[PDB]
From Swiss-Prot:
Residues 1-138 form the AXH domain. It comes from Mus musculus. GO terms for molecular function: DNA binding; RNA binding. The lineage of its organism: Eukaryota, Metazoa, Chordata, Craniata, Vertebrata. This is HMG box-containing protein 1. The chain holds residues 208 to 345 of 516 of the full protein. The gene is Hbp1. The keyword Transcription applies.
Length: 138
């Protein structure tokens, strides 16, 4: 799949409490902001670093955003003290769950929508990004 950031597709909304981005941004927005993977010379922090090992689902809410039903997951980079990452995505959003592979909340729907047969996730399942050595089949 063509992810914009981490294991997230386009049409996903990002909110890292690590930043002042307390409100909903697009993936393409943060991906664009973090276009440089390090501004060590100017402003350190800008990096595809948050969630480099994985995003562990802490809690989940199913809400309706602007008329669209969404999957809201509060993620953990391992030490959430970096900043809680909250995401509103579609019901058919595939998540590369560690040890399991491509998993989702509505796997029967996910495969119909993205053509990817997915496993059932569980609260506390960590999601891996493309390039992570533990993500065997991304």
């Amino acid at each position: 799949p063509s992810t914009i950031w981490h294991c997230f597709l386009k049409g996903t909304r990002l909110c890292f409490h690590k930043e002042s981005n307390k409100e909903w941004q697009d993936v393409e927005d943060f991906a664009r902001a973090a276009s440089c993977d390090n501004e060590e010379e100017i402003q350190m922090g800008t990096h595809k670093g948050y969630g480099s090992d994985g995003l562990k689902l802490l809690s989940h809410e199913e809400s309706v955003s602007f008329g669209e039903s969404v999957l809201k997951l509060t993620f953990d980079p391992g030490t959430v003290e970096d900043g809680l990452l909250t995401v509103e995505c579609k019901l058919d959003h595939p998540f590369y769950v560690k040890n399991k592979g491509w998993s989702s909340f509505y796997p029967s729907l996910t495969v119909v929508q993205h053509g990817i047969p997915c496993c059932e996730i569980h609260i506390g399942d960590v999601c891996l990004p493309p390039g992570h050595p533990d993500a065997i089949n991304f």
